[PDB]
Amino acid sequence: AHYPRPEGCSSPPNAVSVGLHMDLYNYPYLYVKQCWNPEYQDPNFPRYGYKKYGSFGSSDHVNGKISWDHNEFKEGCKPIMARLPTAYNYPAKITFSNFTMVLSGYFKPKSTGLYKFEIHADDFILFNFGSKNAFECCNREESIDNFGPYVAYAMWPNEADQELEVYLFEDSYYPIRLFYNNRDYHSKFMVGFYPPNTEEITYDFDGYLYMLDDTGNEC
Numbered sequence: 416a417h418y419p420r421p422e423g424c425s426s427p428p429n430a431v432s433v434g435l436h437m438d439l440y441n442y443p444y445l446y447v448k449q450c451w452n453p454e455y456q457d458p459n460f461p462r463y464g465y466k467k468y469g470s471f472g473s474s475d476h477v478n479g480k481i482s483w484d485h486n487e488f489k490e491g492c493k494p495i496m497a498r499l500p501t502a503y504n505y506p507a508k509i510t511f512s513n514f515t516m517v518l519s520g521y522f523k524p525k526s527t528g529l530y531k532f533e534i535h536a537d538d539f540i541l542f543n544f545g546s547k548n549a550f551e552c553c554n555r556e557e558s559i560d561n562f563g564p565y566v567a568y569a570m571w572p573n574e575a576d577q578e579l580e581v582y583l584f585e586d587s588y589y590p591i592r593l594f595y596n597n598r599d600y601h602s603k604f605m606v607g608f609y610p611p612n613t614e615e616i617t618y619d620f621d622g623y624l625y626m627l628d629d630t631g632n633e634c
């Protein structure tokens with residue numbers, strides 16, 4: 416009714432594959448054993464600053480249980496090696512203590528209705544969603560950094576939990592861009608949702624995440 420109703424994309428099944436694309440970028444400490452770099456707080460970081468230390472990895476077909484909560488680490492101010500969930504199809508350990516990730520692709524609802532998303536961050540998550548907010552239909556790679564004002568901005572410690580509601584249509588693939596940073600130590604990337612008429616949250620995206628071919632012409 417008076418809920419946000421973002422725009423989505425159409426494609427035939429033959430131009431559709433399963434899962435999101437991931438890029439991983441370096442985020443160094445200032446020094447290693449204010450050890451951590453405050454750069455991630457800069458207003459320009461999400462749009463272009465985040466690539467300035469180079470990339471180190473990528474994957475495709477990211478699907479299913481994409482959230483994590485690593486609060487087992489014992490030492491701060493120190494790179495700590497650990498593995499991403501198996502959802503990411505990325506075998507190597509990463510500097511889990513300090514890194515930047517961009518996840519992008521399309522969310523397709525299994526039914527038409529109001530979806531509520533919830534994010535919980537350590538350190539930083541940005542949520543863009545819709546063809547007029549995240550990126551253009553079938554032009555993801557070129558338009559990935561042309562995102563608009565955030566649908567959710569979650570930052571540790573003071574704004575770490577956020578939520579948003581979007582009314583979505585079964586037939587539509589919605590551009591989604593999820594940005595994550597860890598500056599130091601513990602790492603939480605929790606992105607879940609409540610489908611229509613559903614009380615319990617889920618962190619399993621299986622059957623909701625897709626990629627469309629970048630053929631350009633609004634598909």
Ligand SMILES: OC[C@H]1O[C@@H](O[C@H]2[C@H](O)[C@@H](O)[C@H](O)O[C@@H]2CO)[C@H](O)[C@@H](O)[C@H]1O
Pocket residue numbers: 450451491492537538571598599600601602
């Ligand atoms: O509490 C999560 C928070 O930790 C910060 O690091 C602190 C840590 O909490 C503290 O126990 C330890 O003794 O000092 C650390 C400083 O390195 C992280 O900087 C922050 O990103 C959060 O993960």
Ligand SMILES: [Ca+2]
Pocket residue numbers: 537538597598599600601602
């Ligand atoms: Ca952290």
Ligand SMILES: [Cl-]
Pocket residue numbers: 420421422423544545546547548
């Ligand atoms: Cl939109």
